[PDB]
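Q: Sequence in, structure out?
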Amino acid sequence: TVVNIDRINTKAASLTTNAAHLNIGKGGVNLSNQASGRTLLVENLTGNITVDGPLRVNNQVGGYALAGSSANFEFKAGVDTKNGTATFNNDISLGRFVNLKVDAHTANFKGIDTGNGGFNTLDFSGVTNKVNINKLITASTNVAVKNFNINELIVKTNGVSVGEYTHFSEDIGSQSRINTVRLETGTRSIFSGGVKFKSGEKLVIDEFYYSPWNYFDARNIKNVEITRKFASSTPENPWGTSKLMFNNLTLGQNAVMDYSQFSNLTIQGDFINNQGTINYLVRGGKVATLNVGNAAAMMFNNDIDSATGFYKPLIKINSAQDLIKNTEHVLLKAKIIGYGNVSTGTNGISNVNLEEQFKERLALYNNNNRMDTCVVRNTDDIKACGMAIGNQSMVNNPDNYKYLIGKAWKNIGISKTANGSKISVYYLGNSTPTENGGNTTNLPTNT
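A: Exactly. Output:
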């Protein structure tokens, strides 16, 4: 079985085994010059390959080759079996013009760093099942992968260089996934790095952090799904322009999308908020409009949040108190917008039409106090509401508004529009509650 070898140096082509495991140890694989840097091949016809040490070029983890010379590593596992696993238990770094090709059933890596390199090719096109990667750092990288699980994608930019980027150059199918995408800050004013996909049917991303002067172009991926978080990499102070492009984009259940003037979003197909939340950032008294090229779906449920005693909002506007008054802030524009309640499988059927149900899930906050609708379960909620809309006697004498307890009170004067073409908000000022004022609704009550 196992052929174990501490270290394989080349000096200024092919090591083929046939064994159920080729294990390379801590010495790793060292490639050389233009005499024997120009390609190195490590194969196992029959079994697996495990590398427990780094790839070196001219004796350095750094590496580095000329434009007229590439250093190419090739690992081919299970060549004659199609059941080979190639596992690299050491982080790998590839310097400039250093390429890596792996053929296998399964290819597993810790880190792959091409951040200090340039014109690196990761050729996984002969991987027939799955590539799993812990940490992938790209800059000028041709990532020729079909089916992958990448835990962390770190996309760097290329200084003031032009026409260099992270290229997903194979069709990615419908099964791949990236747990975290982190766009790094690029060079100011330019977009000298970022992600381009050749094509695919569906990509799942759990958390996606964008940064200015970098981009993620997934126009050629029919559908992208964000399962958890889509936000700035510096949410306390987002800045500049990050360019995010999609065909269809879906925000999954309880996922949170932060959307501002700093996140230039192109959505050429459809946008679906499937029971998630879009937080719109106000800068300059204004919001960014989420422009949808084709159809939008706002999907919601009837869960009452334990944290609030009301429906979770699909849209949140914090620092709404800063909104310019007397003007329409258009939040979403699509060719056609649908509204759907997913949990209508409860209570009987509502009398409230879908647009109006949706407007209950459209929230405005005054510094993290809800101001569009006051959810009152007790005296302390009266104060908070008093605080939200700036009514001093609600704060000072809450037992004066005892009539609000058990009730959702609508602050009209924030006016909301949710029709088949847009969602928008028009702010005039704050109303005040009346004993017999109406604008009130009995709170939901789950278990």
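The longest helix spans residues 379-389.
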